């Protein structure tokens, strides 16, 4: 099991939290000044809202695949390199790749 | 059992199909000129690729929740409206976030 992660850079964190609470019918799991997390069961989704003052519209910050444990990150990382994609891994585990249009993807364990 | 729909406007559809096939380990379900879509089981995702032509970078086109049946759409439509969001309905419902990001609830 895994779920997608969608991380949005939003102009108004408070308005966005209010909106996403109503859309998915549940409050954020974690709230800090500067970002909030929703863990949505249905549809399965980890939604990250990142305050991006200055910018005037919501844009994509990055995308991700949240997997159950580190071994899955490892399998993903190996498979991605095998397919010939450039990757960068982090420990404390996460692997990053970038789509041809520049959209960043991370495979990670929460 | 619903799934998110992620629609990306991409500068190069062909390279993108190649990239997502590798990323998710499975080819697209449907391909037309200017358009491809992937139905991914794990993680559950409908990924839509839309040829942009012009833009220099991928951008979010729209977002969605894909549900199993017409009645699920009707339920979401009533829920969203009752919760005070400004919705437009139909079987499809559209709502837009404060930052202008468009959402739709729809059936496959
Ligand atoms: Ni993240
Ligand atoms: Ni769509």
Curated annotation (Swiss-Prot), chain A:
Q: How does activity depend on temperature?
A: Exhibits robust catalytic activity from 37 to 55 degrees Celsius.
Q: Which reaction does it catalyse?
A: methylarsonous acid + AH2 + O2 = arsenite + methanol + A + H(+); roxarsone (III) + AH2 + O2 = 4-hydroxy-3-nitrocyclohexa-2,5-dien-1-one + arsenite + A + H(+); nitarsone (III) + AH2 + O2 = 4-nitrocyclohexa-2,5-dien-1-one + arsenite + A + H(+); 4-aminophenylarsonous acid + AH2 + O2 = 4-aminocyclohexa-2,5-dien-1-one + arsenite + A
- Which residues form each disulfide bond in the chain? none
Q: What is known of its domains?
A: The thiolates of the vicinal cysteine pair (Cys95-Cys96) directly coordinate the arsenic atom of the organoarsenical substrate.
Q: What biological function has been recorded for the protein in this entry?
A: Nonheme iron-dependent dioxygenase that can break carbon-arsenic bonds, playing a role in the detoxification of environmental organoarsenical compounds. Catalyzes the oxygen-dependent demethylation of highly toxic methylarsonous acid (MAs(III)) to arsenite, which can then be exported out of the cell. Can also cleave the C-As bond in several trivalent aromatic arsenicals, including roxarsone (III), nitarsone (III) and (4-aminophenyl)arsonous acid.
**Domain VOC: start-end pairs:** 2-110
Please tell me the species this chain comes from. Thermomonospora curvata (strain ATCC 19995 / DSM 43183 / JCM 3096 / KCTC 9072 / NBRC 15933 / NCIMB 10081 / Henssen B9)
Q: What is this protein's record name?
A: Trivalent organoarsenical cleaving enzyme
* Assembly description: Monomer.
């Amino acid at each position: 099991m895994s779920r997608v992660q969608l991380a949005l850079r939003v102009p108004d964190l408070e308005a966005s939290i209010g909106f996403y609470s109503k859309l998915f019918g549940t409050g954020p799991a974690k709230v800090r000044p500067g970002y909030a997390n929703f863990a949505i069961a249905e549809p399965p989704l980890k939604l990250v809202l990142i305050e991006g003052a200055g910018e005037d519209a919501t844009r994509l910050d990055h995308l991700g695949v949240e997997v159950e444990d580190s071994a899955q990150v490892g399998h993903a990382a190996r498979r991605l390199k095998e397919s010939g994609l450039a990757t960068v891994e982090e420990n404390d585990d996460r692997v990053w790749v970038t789509g041809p249009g520049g959209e960043p993807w991370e495979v990670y364990v929460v």
